[PDB]
Design a protein around this ligand. Structure first.
Ligand SMILES: [Mg+2]
Ligand SMILES: [Mg+2]
Lengths: 257, 257
């Protein structure tokens, strides 16, 4: 029944905990004397990078501190300067985050043996993806297809990129495909496309932890942050949720019944 | 609630009985000393033209007859040559086959007044549609969007053309769109695409009759042929069937339940 699985990139396939963008947003502000925290930086993590910045700008705690430094509130010009800077820095360090999350590679290998096609969509622009995809392929991961917002009329949560994949992979109907992501938007997109939607937890942008803090966190404590997200997913359309990609072929087996 | 209707062209919105291609397909085979019947000629109607030709040669009855006449099955060269001919003959007559089927325009206008999007897919190439769509517009019919196989990996039965229509009209999921066509390939295209599928009988390729033949036929005989086409559309996936486009609106309402 299931002939293809469509994977997201950041916090699903690579970039454990999806920090690259977080790391950058913090820098552009820190260098302006208005240092923000991972929480509020990740707070928006889900909309256009351009609008993501503007969001931080309108965050009362940040807005005030900005008006303290520059003796004035952010200007549409500032947003545009901070956005240009965001990209330049992101391009620069994107390679350092393009490593396949330790579990994933073997999983992909297993699915390909079952004759199951591998697709993918993303929030990163084609420019960014070129860089991310290149480093990931060297490091062992390369989907059969990839699409970015640039390829379509609009990115997430629209199902456009998902249809493009089905088109190229040659798979139909949409319920013969699974969408796997690490954020609310990933769930929306999956449903809007009429496909089986799943959500990874450990290493997601939602769980926001690094491999380090995960391997060295209080079990009880961690087993709780996992739920604030696993639940968070189902509350957005995830026909299912998995702590790790190691549970993927299992969900497939379930679905196919 | 439905938001868009994707109409096929010939036999559905224009060219009553889809006659434009008919004699060209029979002519190309008749020059080789291999006669075919309209039924055969019409079987693959709706598919991309080159595919339609290849499909004809695939047909046992025809393949055997060709093998017997030439002492070998049809070749890619044969196919490619007949196609080159098919195009020459078709192009010089296409303008004469872009007239809207009688009451279709009232329907369309009614759909628009209800805020419904109008998309379309076809088996004709982009070059062919240039002629057909131009003439159709002058005669008052012009959907919001048009898609030929030249815009996607493949034509019918694949649901690719339907997805582009969805991307353009910005409608999702596919279950919010209805597909209307006059052939078997139109039916398989709707179910494959995951939308509500409908087949129109009077004027359809499948009915293969002209307006004269339909208004001057033994009523009893007529209702009987309608039944075969009808049974045929369903047999191939149609969710509902209608005799004319006047019924469409009503089937939409039924579905909205
Ligand atoms: Mg992501
Ligand atoms: Mg037709």
């Amino acid at each position: 029944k299931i002939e293809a699985v469509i994977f997201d990139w950041a916090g699903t396939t690579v970039d454990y905990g999806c920090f690259a963008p977080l790391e950058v947003f913090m820098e552009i502000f820190h260098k302006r004397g208005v240092a923000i925290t991972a929480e509020e930086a990740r707070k928006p993590m889900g909309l256009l990078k351009i609008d993501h910045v503007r969001a931080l700008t309108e965050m009362p705690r940040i807005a005030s501190e900005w008006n303290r430094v520059f003796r004035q509130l952010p200007t549409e010009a500032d947003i545009q300067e901070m956005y240009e800077e965001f990209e330049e820095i992101l391009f620069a360090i994107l390679p350092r985050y393009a490593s396949p999350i330790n579990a994933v590679k073997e999983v992909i290998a297993s699915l390909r043996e079952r004759g199951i096609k591998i697709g993918s969509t993303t929030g990163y622009t084609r420019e960014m993806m070129d860089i991310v995809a290149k480093e990931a392929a060297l490091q062992g991961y390369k989907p059969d297809f990839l699409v970015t917002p640039d390829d379509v009329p609009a990115g997430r949560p629209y199902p456009w990129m998902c249809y493009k994949n089905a088109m190229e992979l040659g798979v139909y109907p949409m319920n013969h495909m699974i969408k796997v992501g690490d954020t609310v938007s990933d769930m929306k997109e999956g449903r809007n496309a009429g496909m089986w939607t799943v959500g990874v937890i450990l290493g997601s942008s939602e769980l926001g932890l690094t491999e380090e803090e995960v391997e060295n966190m209080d079990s009880v404590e961690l087993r709780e942050k996992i739920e604030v997200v696993r639940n968070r997913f189902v509350e957005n359309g995830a026909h299912f949720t998995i702590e790790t990609m190691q549970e993927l072929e299992s969900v497939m087996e379930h679905i196919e019944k």
